[model samples]
Structure formats: structure tokens, C-alpha cells
Target: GRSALIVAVLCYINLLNYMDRFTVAGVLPDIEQFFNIGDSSSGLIQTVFISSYMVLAPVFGYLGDRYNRKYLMCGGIAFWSLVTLGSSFIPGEHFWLLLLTRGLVGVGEASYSTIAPTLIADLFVADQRSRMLSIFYFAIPVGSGLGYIAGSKVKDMAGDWHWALRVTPGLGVVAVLLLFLVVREPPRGAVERHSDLPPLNPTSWWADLRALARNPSFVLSSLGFTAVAFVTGSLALWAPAFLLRSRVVLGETPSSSDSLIFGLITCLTGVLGVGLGVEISRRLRHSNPRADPLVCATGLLGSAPFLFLSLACARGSIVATYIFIFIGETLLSMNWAIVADILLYVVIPTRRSTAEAFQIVLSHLLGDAGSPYLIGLISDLQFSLMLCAFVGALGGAAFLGTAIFIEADRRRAQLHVQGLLHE
Candidate 1:
């Protein structure tokens, strides 16, 4: 069993990962005005970040297999923190410098994302990985919410948005020091063995990649995750802007006050809903290995209508819109634990890093990495924020429905293969 302290450290690092990911979104207003851009151009900011992340995932994934993941995590945390701090200092007039800083942050972060989960997998047993991953993934709402909170308060403290951007990195610096001091590297694949599996070779990136592709579960799960990523990425990046537009059209000015208020609501409700869904699914999975993925599919199905209402009809009642978005966030976030579990299950223990890399490449390439840019371009053409939200909600529905059949077919195939082996 892993020590509680290690779990805490992982959670802290996960929180930092999200805080860094979201610091940009929190400062959207200032960045947009400084760069003299609209939603389309602003979307490119995140596109650059995710694109770099996508390119670097495989490289870092191979590194995780070959080296000590803990050191990689520590170094990644430190480097990205510096990158984040550096971003705040880029002169507003030099937009290219800001993009370069954002790109640097992406490169640093790619190292951590590609390593941390593999590190966690090495720490826990198969069943425990999902629960641990759920807690670690909790960083998404928690850190992002805190970033908005920091964004709201830090400007007042430092008298500039630049200093606001610097705050999260300072926290990351603290996390890096803690990780290096306290976290120990664990043996990989301690939970899965029959004395038959070959000892891992450090120089097998090509072989690992090929093996991962041949796994049907891995391929389908990656594609399914990509759909979810696209939907969520588009919504998360643009929802603030959607809210801002709704307010403006109603003749109200958008301010940090409003942003902070909405962000807090999203975080509080999101954490609550996601935590509930995961706990419930864990209980159900006692008799069901498919509980996690199926539960996620069900959540997506049920959440689509609320998402539709929020985007299409919830104007004039800020309260109603918040409620709808909050429910959607809950359904969206609950899938985190499920996704982690599915990914870890479908690969051999030694192939965790490469499998995760393949998933990352698929998920981001088809999903989040492109969503913001595509949505922004769409919004620019449609000139309606509501239309973009509608498309995202519909895409989510399609993804959920498609997963059901794909998952069933894979499960059937697994059973058939097992039966053949027995015969």
C-alpha cells in the first residue's frame, strides 16, 4: 500500500498542473485587450498551449518509461512554474513574446502530465488506481477555481494583472520542492505479474507504440476520450466568454467581480457533483468492471439536455444558466475517475507510459487541442455565442451514445479471446 503522504503529494502536484493550465483562462480579459484581439484570436492562445502539449506527449511518455518519473515530475513542476512567472512579465505590446511564453509553459507542463499518472500507477494496485486518480483529477476544478479566485484578489494586491499571473507559479515552486523532498520512486508493475512477463527494456519506444495500437480497448477508449475532450475543451474555454456576452447583451458590464462569482459557483457545484458520481460508481463497480465507463456514458447522456437548455434558452435568468452549467460540469467532471480507470486497465503494466501517451495524442488531437480554435472560428462566422455552445452540447451527446456500442463490442471480444485460451 502507498503512504498517505504520497497521495497528498500527487494531489498537490495535480492541483498545480491545473492551476498552470487555467491561469491563462482566468486572465482572459486582460490578455485579450492587451493583444487587441477578439474571441477567435484569444482562442489561439490555448490552441498553442495544447498543440505543444500534444507534440511533446509521446517524447515525455517514452522518457517516463526510461527514467525516474519522480525526477521528471519535480523538474517539470519547477520549469513550468518559472515559465508561468515569466508569462506575467511579457510586455502586453509584444504579443509574440506572450505566445512564446505560453508555448514554453506548455512544453514544461507536457513533461508533468505524461509522467504523473504513470507515477501514480506505479504507486497503487489496479482497483485503487481509479480512486486515487479521481482524487488527483480533483485538481481540475479546485485549482482552476483557485486561479479565478487568485485572479480576482491578486490584481488588488499587486496593483497589476501581471502579478496576478505570477502567483500560481510561486505555488508551483513550493510544490516542486515538496515533491523532491518527500516523494520516492516506486517499482513499476508491482501489482501485476505471473513471472512470465518479460522484464522491461528501456529502449523499446517503437515496440511499445506498436503493441498499444494493436489493443482494441486502447484504441476505442482513446477515441471516446477524444470526443469528451473536444466537448469540454470548447465549453470550458468559451463559457466565460459566453457568460460575458449574455451579460453584455442584457446591458451589463463584465467585470472581474462577475467572473469570480461564476467561477466559484462552478467549482463548488462541480466538485460536489463529481465526487458524488465517482463514489456512487465505485460502490456499483463491486460487481461490475464496466461500471466506470458505463456510468460515464450515462452521465453524458443525461447531461446533454441540461446543456442544451443552458445554451439555447437560459437567457435573462443568470441563476438558471448557472444551475444548468453547474449540472453539466458535474457530469463532465465525474468522467475523470472513469477515464483513468479504463486507460489503466486496457494496457499492460510495463506499457503504461506508452499507452497513456497514445491516449493523450488521440484525445487532444481530436478533442480539446482543436475545440477552442474551431469554436472560436465558428463563433467568428456565426457571430453568436449560443450557437457554439449548442454545437458542443450536441457533440457531447454523440460521444456518449457512440461509446456504449464500442464498449460492448470490446467487452465481447475480450470474453471470446478468454474462452479460446481456456479451450
Candidate 2:
């Protein structure tokens, strides 16, 4: 069966994809200094990645559904690797060129971003899909954390930012080899047929696009998750700097030697928290279908107070700061599992990528693309980073509560329809 191998390879690629995307956040202080930019400009770096991510999702989504998803995944991996490698050579004085390369990296990422999940669904049965997908999303925190470590170490050893940028491509190259050697394409609709669902409508692409637009739960979830992404993305992009700045304010400014150590510790902790929380949620949610989305919603709700505490405690209390960070990362990690479940059960298999594509677009366009920049802007205007972070947490909590209600309603409707059919 293509199930296990496909999941493994796709998960590897996902790890690489996030590492590449998270490079900016991990090295925010270095990047800010290198480009002589402010926090707002630092935030715009995410805007560049996320904006390209948003626009390219549907285009790649169509391609994934219509073409061989494995090739697309491989191609995206290779493309982004080159962009990351190329970023090292970008002239130090040319800030625009560096931003351009970053944006190009995002475009390359869009392909895998859209296709890999669809491939997983095509390969795995629904009974196992949610857990498998949650396992796959483990890459998000792992890769991001690894990226921070790599970026920090490179900056440390070579004493050059270019080397830091150049190094991650090696990891991407290894992932590419694994994909080509290991992943095989399963027959389209194979998994769907197993579910006793209707055959895919062989309609034109336009019709498929229209079909995706009509699902209200999908629409609401997509919109809601976008808000989540925005806040999370913004936080990831700026938190390191926020920590560093707060350290300075407390008269405990970390030297460059602390960069690698701090980056590695923070990122590794994040990876652990995300992986653990997701696994816990998966086990808990298995007993109740509503538990899937509800767990995610509760994570967001519970995270709010910790987030506020983290911001307020950022002033040199290392123990307190890390406690908050760990809690925030744990809660944030639950989101991808919810998203995986949504995509697996919420729509027909044929339209999975399109549904995911919509999620990708709305999430980035509305969420991450702006949150970092907006937070930075507010911080600058108000001279209060703590306040901006607090506001972001509150916004996330509100959205999460709303998502819980909507998700409960969706579960009830699904159960009601199932009951009717059984009668």
C-alpha cells in the first residue's frame, strides 16, 4: 500500500517547507539589523511569504487535483531549495533583492502547500486520515524549530548571514531524494471509492471551483482559520525579537553568542509542545467527533491568559517567559490537527485540495499576511509591544470561541443527516 511511504515522504517535505518559511522569524534580529529595518518592515517579510502563499494556493490546488501530486511536491521542494540557496548570494546592500528572493521562495512553496495533503488523502482511508494528517503536521513546529537552530548556528560559526541562508537547502535536497525514491502515486479516487462515496464529478475545472465556493462550513472554517493563521504567523515572526528586546529593556541584553543557544532552546521547546499537544488532542478527540475542532478552540481560549502573561513577563524573567512560550506553542500546535480533520471529513474527496486551497488563501490573505505588520505598526505607534501581543491574543480567543460553536453545529448536522439516511 502507498499509505505509509507516501505519508513519510510528504511529511519530510512538509518539514522542509516550514523550515524555509520560518527562516525569517528565527533570525528576525539579524535580518532587522542586516537590512536596517524596523519591526514593521520585519513583519512585512511575513507579508511577502504569506501573500504569495495565499495567491498561489488555488492555482496549485487545481494542478494537484488535475495532475500528479507527487511530481508537484517534488518540483516545489526543488524550487524552494534553489530560492533558499540563492538567498545567500543576495547582495548585502540590496534589501529589495532579498525580499524578492523570499517572495519567490513563497511561490515555490505554494505548490507543496496545496498538493501534499491531497496526496495524503488520496492514499489513506478516512478512518486513519485525521491521525495521519495530524502526525504529518508535526513538521510545522519541528521544522520551524530546526530552522531557528540552523539559522542561529550558521550565523554563529560563519559569522555571516549568507551562510545561514545557504545551509537549509541541504536539508531540502535530502527531502527531495526521499520523495523521488520513495513516493508513488496512488490511483485517483481510490480512497474515495473505499468510503462508498459518490464518484467524483468529471466536471470542468470551473465547475469544481464553483463547487468549492458553495460549502458554508468550509467557507466559515477557512475564514476562521485564516484569523488563527494571522495571529500565529505574526507571533512566530516577531516573538524572538520581542524576547530579545525585552531582554535589553531589562538590562540583560543577549550577545550574538547567545543567538544559537536561545534559538535552539526556544524552537526545540516549541516543537515538543506542538507535537505533544497534537497527539494529546488526537487521542482525546477520538472519543467524540466534536472533540476535534473543540479541542483546537479550547486551546486557543486557554492560551489567551498565558499569552498575556508571556508578554507582561517578557521583562527578563527567563522562567516565566519560557512558561508562557511553552503554553502558547502547545495551544497553537492544535490548529493544524483541526485543519486536517476538517479537510478529511468536511468535503468530498475530489474537492479536498480546493477546500484546502480556500483555507490556504483566506488564512494567509487575512491572517499571517497582515498580523505581523499590524502588530509591529501598533507597537511602534503605542510604544507597547506587550499591548499589541495582548490584543492579538484576545482576537485569537474570540475567533476560537466562535469556531467552537460553528464546529458543534456542523457535527450535529452531520449526525442528523446520518440518522435520516439510516432510517
Candidate 3:
């Protein structure tokens, strides 16, 4: 049960981690009013934070490989929590101060995010790993949903949006303590083999990078994930607005319910998708060793037509659009857990953090980071949203590409872990 407890702790911390992130969005209007900021300035709040996170993940990844990872997360999470608490106390006119702390918050996230999964990889392998990873990823959608629900609720009860940001830090202290007390750092890649594994002699960062780049399974799947990011990012940012436009075209009076409803759908679909995906892959893996990437590709391939039809139906019937969205999103979400699983199995243990960092940067940079803006710039709202369908197809192709190299790559890692092969 030590592995159970460890993953439970990771899941809890991950929940708080994302909850703190979207809580700001939950009370976004209040913050905008408080600072008297414009659209561009307010958008920068999220931009700066993600930008810092993307930049720092690799830095932490290199250290995570070369040094003791436990204390890296402990110290980083402490500073992150403290800085977050301080952020809530920023003066109304000091919007710049709020921005700085938000950027700093990413340091904590990068440390935990890039490192935590590798621990899970080290803790469990095969179907046990898949089960644990699915539950672990569920925290993301579940936590994000709660951020909206609880953050705005807390803000209302406290009569200040700033108070919403205050809640996680107190809980974060408890999370950090649990990490220090309960979670032991397991030997990386030891679980993959029963034999005595060799010591981890770290290699140069560039060497790691070159190794990762040469791994076709990693590169193609990373590209696939970028497509996932782009589509999800665009949808998350604009789906509500698109729903609003749907209503307007139907000559209905405007209301603000779309965002709330859309958020609800996101949470439920994500949880469903992640769970069902693991179940599907678990069964498939029995017959096909390369089932991981195949499941991912199928989900995206299946998702495209549905996401497209969701847009296609919007002007005619709002309810029909939702049905399509639920199906499409669930299929899209199936990628989250499986993608991470693919990375863990394909990359060697020592470079998992660096690989994770590399995936994060690609997904954020090429995927979610700019898709929202790109869609916003397009003339027709629905047309821009239609882009997700095409992107989903591309993602499907990348995973199909991943399946090609995955068998060889996955076996390569297994051989390396057994002390029988060298990269």
C-alpha cells in the first residue's frame, strides 16, 4: 500500500495544483474590475504564467535528472505556496505584482509536474501502472471543475476574489508535509525488471535531448499531443462564446449560462474519457503489445467527425450540438492518460523528466498556447472552431505514426532497464 499512498498523495497535490490555477479564471471578472484592466492586459495574466512554466520545466527537468528530485519538489512547492499566498495580498493598483507572482507559481508546478509521473512510472508497471495513471490524471479535470465551482463560491462568501486564491496555499502546506513524510523516492526503472538494476549515471542534457529527438515514438506522439493541446485549448477558451453565438443566431435573448454549462461538461467528459480509455487500452494490451498508441490514435480519429458535427449542428439545434460535444470530447480526452503512459514506457527512466519537459513545451507552445488566439483572429467563429476537427485528424495520424515506432522503442527501454542494452 506504500505505492497506493504515494500516488494518492500525488493525486491530491495535483488537484490542488490545478485548482489554484483555474481558480483565478473562476473569478477573472472580479480581478479585471479590481485592476481596471483591458482585455489584452488581463489575457497577459495567463500568458505570463504559462510562458514562465514552459521555460522553467526544462530547467527543472535537467536538475531532476542530475540531482535529488524529492527536495527539488519540496522547496519549489513551498516557495510556490508562499508566493501564491502573497499574491492574494497584492494592492489593487499593483497588477504588475500579481503578474510576477503568477509567473513564479510555475516554478512550483514545473518541479512537481515533470517529476511526479516518473515516480509513478518507477512505482508500478504494466496494467497496475495504467490504473494508477488514469486515477492520477482524473484529478486534472476534476480539480479544474472544482476550481470554478469552489473558487467563485469562496469569492462570493468572502466578498473578495482575492480570498479565493487564499484557499489552496493553506492546503498546499499540508500537501508538502505529506510528501515529505510519506512518499519515498523509489529507484527509477527498477520496477520494470526484477533483477538488480545498475546505478543511474546521469548524462549531458544535450545528449538526452538528442536521444529523445531520435526516438520516433516520442517525437510523433509529442506532435500528436500538440494537436490535442491546440484543439482543447481553443475549445476551452472559446466554446462558451461559440454557444453564445449559437443562441444569438437563433434569435434568443443572450444569457451567461453557456460558460458554466460548458465547464460542467468539460469536467464530466474528461473524467469519463480518462477512465474509459484506460479500460479500453487495458483489454487491448492483452492482444496487442502496441495497444497504447493505437488506442490514442483511434480516439482522436473517432473524435474528429463528432467535433466537426458539433459545430455543424450549432446553428440548427443547441442540444444536438451538446450531444456531439460530449461524445467528441470524451474521445479527445482519452488521449491524456495514454499519452503520458506512452512517454513513460518509450523513454528511459533517467530522461523521463526531460522528456516530460519537452512534451510540456511542445504541447503548450504549439498546441494550446496560441490556438485560442488563432481561432479568435479568424473571421467566422464556427469556421475557426471547425479547425479542431482537422487538427484531431492530424493528431490521429501522429499517433498512427507513433504505433509504427512504438514496438521497437518500448522494447528498447525494457532492454535498457534489464541492464542488457545501451542507448
Candidate 4:
């Protein structure tokens, strides 16, 4: 009962975390119009947010492994909520202040994102961990979809972008209250007993990271995730606008209608993709130890053709475009739960938070942190959205490479686990 409650509450918090993150994207078109900015400047909103997030992730990661995570998470939720509320009051002339608040929001989310999965890992053992993670990460798509819907509908209802930004802070406050009152921190590494692994040395943050660097599975999975992040960040920020623009080219009214439709698609695909991926991965793991990375590679590679077709059909047929996007994104969404599982299984418990943090930094720094801005710049320069298809293809290649290294890495991790159990 307690474990189920933990998953339920944390999953809700995870949902809110993503909702706030993408809320800006839902209203990006309005924000651009209100501030009279170009694509690069508008894209900078997410760029700055992710930049601060990537910079602060390691600090929180270091602290998380050694601190009272419950309090840390509570403080983060409260801080971001307050900052988000304060953002609603920013005047039209002070776009910089808005950017600053977004950065502060990033700081708050960094605390939660880096720590939450580690908590889940502690509460559940191996295969169960993967299943719970699927439930937890299901929030990414659902929350993101709601963000689009909330931002668009609220803007439509209140006739201002500020109102859309105002919606999630209250939800954040409620999440904080529930987290502190209800969630209990589990003992680190409680699920797996490892006697052979050396005692954790707190002074070895550098060593822990270096060890991660050498782990082929960890490195490959992170590289694969970078591709996922690149595609997700680009689409989350630009898709609503892309669809709206395409509709305009077809002589339709410029409205937030596309945001709502796209949000629905995202939510549905995320739900089905994560569920199916988790089920298939769980079943295949017994037969094939490398099933996890294979699933991710297949998803990435399979997604590319549909993504290309979606972009190719963008102006020609709305129905065909949506159909291809739905198929592509479902395939793309399959990696989230499995990747988190891969990290947990491959990395030791004491350093899992740091691993998560490192992956965040690497993925965002190379992926989303720049992709949104880069895509915007390209769109402005060449007047094309087709370039994103190439980015998806690159992500597929990265995941394919990861498949080669997974079996060797899994063996290494199993040896470490055996060492821990016997020692």
C-alpha cells in the first residue's frame, strides 16, 4: 500500500513537473507576438531554461545522494511554484525578467528531476523498477500534453499569455504539500544487496563520474537519450507553431487549435507507447538480456521514416501529416521508461543520482539545450522545418550503436551485483 502510494504521488508530481516545463511552448506563439520577437529570441526562452537546468543538475545530484531528499524536493517545488507565480506579473516591456524566472524554474525542476527516479529505484527491485519507472515517466507525455492544452485554453479564455503561465504554480504548491506529508524516503540500495562492491566513498564524486564515463552501456544510453531529447525539445517547442503556420498557409485562421489537437496526440501516443514498450521489454528481457537497448534502437530507427513523412506532408495534407506524426512520436516515446531502467540496472545505487544528473547534462547540453534554438535559426534562415527529420535520423544511429555495447555492459553490471551480494 505504501509503495503504491509513493508511486501514485510521485507520478502526479512528475506530471506537474513536465506540465510547467512545456506550458511556455503551448503559448510560444502568443509570447512571440506579445514580445514582438523573432524565432531565435523566442527559442531562447526554452534555451535559457534548459541551460540553467543543465548547469544546476550536478549540484543537486551531488546533494541528493547525501541529503534528506524529501526536504530537498519540497524546497524545490515550493521555490519553482513561487517563481512561476511571480512570472505572471512580468510586464510586456520586461521580457528579460520573464527569461530570468524561467531560469529559476529550471533550478527548481533540477532538484526534483535528478532525485525522483533515484527514489523510485530505491523503492523497487530490478524488473519491478522498470515497470514503476514506466508509470512515473508516463507523466512526461501526459503533463506535456496538458501543458499545451492548459496554456492554449487559458490564453483563449483569459485573452493573455500570462494567465496560461499562472495555471501550474498552484498545482506545484499542491504537489509540494503532498510530497512532504505523504512520501517517505527509502533506504539507498535497499532493493539490491551487494557485498562485493567497495564501500561508497563520499569524496569520490570525481571517481564515480569517471567510472560512469568508462561504462559503455551508460555512455551509449546517454548518447541515445541525447537524440531523444533533441527531437522532443524541438517538437515540444515548435510543433504547435509549425502546425499553426501550416494551417495559415492553407488559409485557415491562426489559433491555438493546433495546440489542443497536438496535445491530444502527444498524450495518447505517450500512454500507448510507454505501456507497450514496458510490456514488451519486460517479456523480452528474460529471452534477451540486451532487450532494453534493442527496443530503444528499434524505436529510434523506426521513428525516422514516419517523422520524415510527417514533415514532407506538412503543407500538402493535414490528415497525412498528423497520421505520420502519431506513428513516429509513439515509436520515439518508447525509450523513456527503458532508458531510466537501463541506468538503474547498470549504475550502482549510491551513484545512480549522479548518473541521472550526468545524463541530463549531456543530453540537454548536446540535445535540447541547443536544438530548439538551432531549429529556429534554421527555420528563419532557410524557411524550412524539414531539417528536424535529419536530426531524428542521427538519434537513430546513436541508439543503434548503443545496442552493440549493451550485452557486455550488462555482464559487467551483473558481476558487480554478484560481488555486492557475496561481499
Candidate 5:
């Protein structure tokens, strides 16, 4: 009962977490027009958010591993909610203040993102862990889709972007309340087959960092995820705008309709794609221990061509364009659950938060921190949606490299756990 409750509550909170994150993206055009900003400046909003997020993740990771994670998560939810509430009141002319608030919001999310998965890992064993993570991450698209719908509909109803920003903080407040009152943090590694292993010394933070740095599979998977982050960040910020512009070129009045349409597609594709990937990886694990990386590699590789096709169909046929985008995004979405599972399996439970934090820093710093701005700058130069496809291809290759190294790494991890249990 408690386990089910924890997943249910955390999933809802995760949903709100992403809803708040992407709401701005859904209403970027309104914000741009109200502030009279260019694409670069518009993209900078996300860049600022991700930069602050990446910079602070390590700090949160350290604390999550050492302290009471439930309260840490509660504090994060409250902080971001308050910042988000404050954002809704900023005058249109004070764009810098809005940006500052968004950056602070990143700091708040960093606290939750680094720790939540570790909690889930503690809640379930191996196979169940992957399944639970799939459910947890399913929130990403559903929440993002709702964000698009909320941002668009709220703006249309209220006649401003501020009202769109207001929607999430209300949900966030509810999430925080539930998190504090209901969720119980499990003893770390309690569900593992090797739970009898010696407890991790609480003071070896630096050593944990060094161990993660040396893990080849972890390093490679993080690189692949960096590519995923780059593409996702760029798309999340610009896809609505891109679709809106495409509609304008086709002689339609620009509105939030495009955001709604794409949001639906994202939600559907993400849900279906992640579900399929989780099933595939689970079945294949019986035959191949490296199935996780293999699934991720295949998804990334298969996604690239379809991604390019979607871009090609952009001006030709709307139906064809959306079909291709759905296929491509579905493929791209497959990695989320599997890569996370890989991290949990490879890293000891005590260091998993740090691993999550480290990956967040690397993925965002080298990945999304600048990708949105970079894509916006390139879009200014020429409409280059194909750039994302190229990055996806590179990411696929990185995951393939992980497949080569992952089985060996898993063996080593299993042996280490066994040694600890015997000791």
C-alpha cells in the first residue's frame, strides 16, 4: 500500500514538475511579442533556467544522499511554487526579473529531479524498478502536453501569458502538500537482492564522485543523454514556435492551436514509445544483459531518419509531417527509462543521487544549456531543423558504445555487490 502510494504521489508531483517547466515553452510567442524579443533572447530564457539547474544539481545530489530526502523534496516543491507564483506578477517590461525567477525555478526542480529516482530505486527491485521508472517518466510528456494545453488555453482565456504561468503553481502547491503529508522515504537499497551488503559510509561523497567518473558505462550513457537533452531542449523551446510559424506561412492566423496540436502528438508518442521500450528491454534482458543499451541505441538510430523526414514534410503536408514527428519523437523517448535503469543497476544505491546529479549537470551543461539558444541562432541564420536529427544520430552512436561496455560493467557491479554482502 505504501509503495503504491509513493509512486502515485511522486508521479503526480513529477507531472506538475514538468508542467511548470514546459508551460513557458507553450506560450513563448506571447511572451516574445509582449517583451518584443528575438529568437536568441527568447531561447535565453530556457538557457538561464537550465544553467542554474545544472549548476545547482550537484549540491542537491550531495544533500539528497546524506539527508532526509522527503523534506528536501518538499522544500524544493515549495520553493519553485513560490517562485512560479512570483513570476506571474512580473510586469511585461521587466523581462529580466522574469528570467531571474525562471532561473530560481530551475534550482528548485534540481532538488527534486536528483533525488526522486533514487527514492523509486529504493522502492522496487530490478525488473519492477524499470517498470516503475517508465511510469514515473511517463509524466514527462503528459505533463508537458498539459503544459502546452494549459499555457495556450489559459492565455486565450485570460488574454495574457501571466495567467498561463499561474496554472502550474496551484498544482505545485497541492503536490507539495501530498509529498509532505503522505510520502515515506524508504531505507536506501532496501529492495535490492543484495540488501545485506554493508551500508555506505555517509562521508564518502568525494569518493563516490570519483567512482562515477571512472565508470565507462555511466560516462557513455551520460554522453548519449547529453545528446538527448540537446535535442529535447531545442525542440521543447522552439517546436511550438516552429509549428506556429509554419501555420502562418500557410496563411493561417497564428494562435495557440499549434501548441495544442503538437502537445497532443508529444503526449501520445511519448507514452506509447516509452511503454514499448520498457517492454522490449524487459523481455530482452533474459537473453542479453546489455538489452537496455541496445534498446536505447536502436531507438536513437531509428529516430534520426524519421526526424529528418518530419522536417522535410514540414512545408509539404501537415499530416505527413505530424506522422513523421510522432514516429521520431516516440523513438527518441525510448531512452529515458532504460538509461535510468542502467544507472541504478550500475551505481550503488548510496551514490545514485550523486550519479543523477552529475548526469544532470553534464547533460544540461553540454546538452540543453545552450542547445536552445544555439538552435534559435541557427534558425535565425537558416531554418535548420535537421540539426537536431544529426545530433540524434550522434547520440545513437554513443549509446551503441555503451552497449559494448554495459554487460561487462553490470558484471562488475554484481560482483561488487556480492563481495559487499559476503564481507
Candidate 6:
């Protein structure tokens, strides 16, 4: 029950972190208009945060896999909560203050991303381990979708985008105390023993990294997920903004209702897609050895055309745009849980954070941090939006690369356990 409670809290924070990211995105139109900025400048709001976030991810990952991670969780949550709380109060003239604070908060939130999943790796028994990881992983997209949905709702209710920034901080404040008192540090690499995961070696970070680099399944899927990070990065901050612009082109008298509408669409598809992937892959496992990677490949590949159609439909009809987005996003989301699950099995327990860190860094470096701004630069936003569809196809190709090695690498991972314990 304590572990279950901890699981709940961890997922709670997971939602807190991502919801805040898209919360900013949801109200992005006002953010640009309020500060008297244009597309490139507006894009930096997201870029600065992500660039700061990407930089420290590996450091956190390295430290995360090594020590009493509860210490990191407590301190990091409070740090970002304070930064976000502070950022909300800045005067309108001081827009750089907003950018700097967003960047700083990125550093703070990097605390939990690399650590939390590995905590599950250490805590749960076998059958439930996979279940909890799926539960934990799915929380990410839901929070992301909710961010834009609820972020706009808060802005509407409070009468200012600044106030919307305040929503998650109090939750962050509450989470810190709970983590300190009840959510004690889980035993590292302990739960994996239930299924001997021998005591892990005192290997250097380089050693852990090399092993990861050596695993084709891990490398390919991380790259596949990188494509995912890139695609989501491009859309998440800009999609609602883009939709608003789309309505403007036809003189529809303007609305943030589209922002709210997009949030629901993202949430519905996320819920539907994650379940679809789990069900489809589970059923296919009986017949196909490469089921997990195969499903991921299918999601990325299938979503490409629908996403293309969604962006293109913006000119012809708005509802048609939403309809295609629903189909595209559902397909895009199908791989959310599976990629993390795939990483967990392929990498040994002790090094899981490094693998995750590597994923986060690349996903940000070349992905979201760039997408919003890059997409913003083009005069015709609709035409620039084509980048995501192509990137999604690249992701599908990478997953197909993972499918070939899924069996072999998984065998090596399990055999890694047996080899160490048996000796």
C-alpha cells in the first residue's frame, strides 16, 4: 500500500511537471500578445525552458542512478515551484524575466524526470512492474494534453495568463512535504531481484553508457523516441497557436475555444491511443515476437498522413482539421507507453537513468527546443507544419529498426542477469 501510494504521488508530480510545460503553451497566444513579441520571440519562451532542461538532464540522470534520489526529488520540486511562482508575478515590461525564469525552472524540473521511473524499477514486484511503468509512462501524455486544456481554462477564469502560471506551484509545494514524509527512497535494483538480479557493479557512468551504446535495440528505439520528442515538441507549443491563426486567415471573429477544443482532442487521443497500443501489442505477442516495436512503427507511420491532412485541412475547413488531428494524434500517441517499457527491459536496472537521460537530452536538443521556433519562422505556418508529418515517418522508420533487434537485445538483457548471478 505504501508503494502504491508512492506510485500515485510520483504520477501526480509527473502530471505537475508536464502540465506546466503545455500550460504555458495553451496560453501562448496571450503570452506573445501581452509582451509585444512576434513568432520567433514567442517561440523562445519554450526554447529557453527546453534548452535549460536538456542541458542538465544527463547530470541528473547520472546522479539519479547513484544516490538517495528522494533528496533530489524534494529539493528539485521546491526549486521549480518557487521559480514558476516567482515568474507569474513579473511585470509586463520585464519579458526577459519570464524567459530567464522559464529557463531556470527547466533546470529545477529536470530533477524528477530521470529518477522517478527507475524508482518504480526498484520498488515493484514482477508482473506489476510492467503495469506500473505503463501507468507511470501514460501519465506523461495525459498531463501534457491537460496542460493546454486546463491552462487555457485557468487563464479564462483568472482573467490573466500570469495567474495561470500559479496553478501547479501549490501542488508542487504539497508534493515536496509528502515526498519527504511518506514516499521514502526505494531500494535501488531491489525489485528486479524478485523475478538474481545480482548486486550491480560500481561501474563508471562511461561504462554504463557504453553498454547502452552497444545495445542496438536501445539505441534504435531511443532514436525512434527522439523523433517522437521532436514531433511533439513542434506541435505541443504551436498547435493551438497555429489553430488560432488558421481561424484568423478566414476572419472567424477569433476564439480560445479552439485551444480548449485541442486539449480535449489531445487528451482523448492519448487515452485511446495508449490503450490501443497496449492491447494491440499484447494480442500480437502470441503471434509476433516483435510486437512492441512493430506497433510503435505502425503508430508513427500511420499518423504521418493524417497529421499532414490535419495541417492541410486548416485552409479548407477548421472542423476537418480537428478531425484529422484526432486520427493523427491517436496514431502518434500509440507508442507513448511502449517506448519506455522497451527501454526498461533492454537496459539493466542500474543504468536505466543514463538511458533515459540520453533519451531526454537528444529529444530536446534536436526536437522541441527547435521545432516551435523553426516552424514559426516560415510565413505560411501551414506549409511549415509539414515538418512534423515527415518527422513522424522518420520515427516509424527508427522503430522498424528496433523491431529487428527486439528479440536479440532482450535476450542479451536477460542473459546479462543470468550471467552475473550464475557466476
Per-residue lDDT tens digits of candidate 6, residues 193-249? 543444556478888878888889988998888888678657766788777877778
Winner on lDDT between 2 and 5 is 5
Ranking by lDDT: 3, 5, 4, 6, 1, 2
| Total backbone collisions, model 2 | 3
- Best candidate according to TM-score: 3
List TM-score per model, in order: 0.82, 0.79, 0.97, 0.87, 0.88, 0.86
- In candidate 6, list every pair of residues with a backbone clash: none
Better of 2 and 6 by TM-score: 6
Error of 6 at 30 (Å): 5.5
Badly placed stretches (over 4 Å) of model 1 are 28-41, 87-93, 194-198, 237-258, 311-318, 379-423
* Candidate 6: stretches off by over 4 Å: 26-39, 125-127, 149-161, 194-198, 235-254, 308-321, 376-389, 419-423
- Which whole-number lDDT from 0 to 100 does residue 55 have in model 1? 87
Model 4 lDDT per residue over 134-214, tens place: 998787788877887788789999998899889998888788878987898776676675545554445478877787888
The whole-model lDDT of each prediction reads 0.70, 0.67, 0.85, 0.82, 0.83, 0.79
Q: Where does candidate 2 have its weakest 10-residue lDDT segment?
A: 414-423
Which structure is stronger by TM-score: 4 or 6?
A: 4
Better of 1 and 6 by lDDT: 6
Question: Candidate 3: lDDT over CA atoms?
Answer: 0.85
Residue 209, model 5: Cα distance from true site in angstroms:
2.0
lDDT of 3 by residue, 1-423 (tens): 888999999999889889888888888888988999978876799888889899999999998887777888888888889998999898897898989998999778877888888888889977888988998899988998898788889999999888988988998899889999999877766777664545767778889999998889999999998998788877777777667776877878443477778888899899999999999999999899889889999988888778777766777888889989999899889899999889989888889999999999889888646675677678445467557677878888999999999999988877877778865
| Cα shift from native, residue 418, model 5 (Å) | 4.1
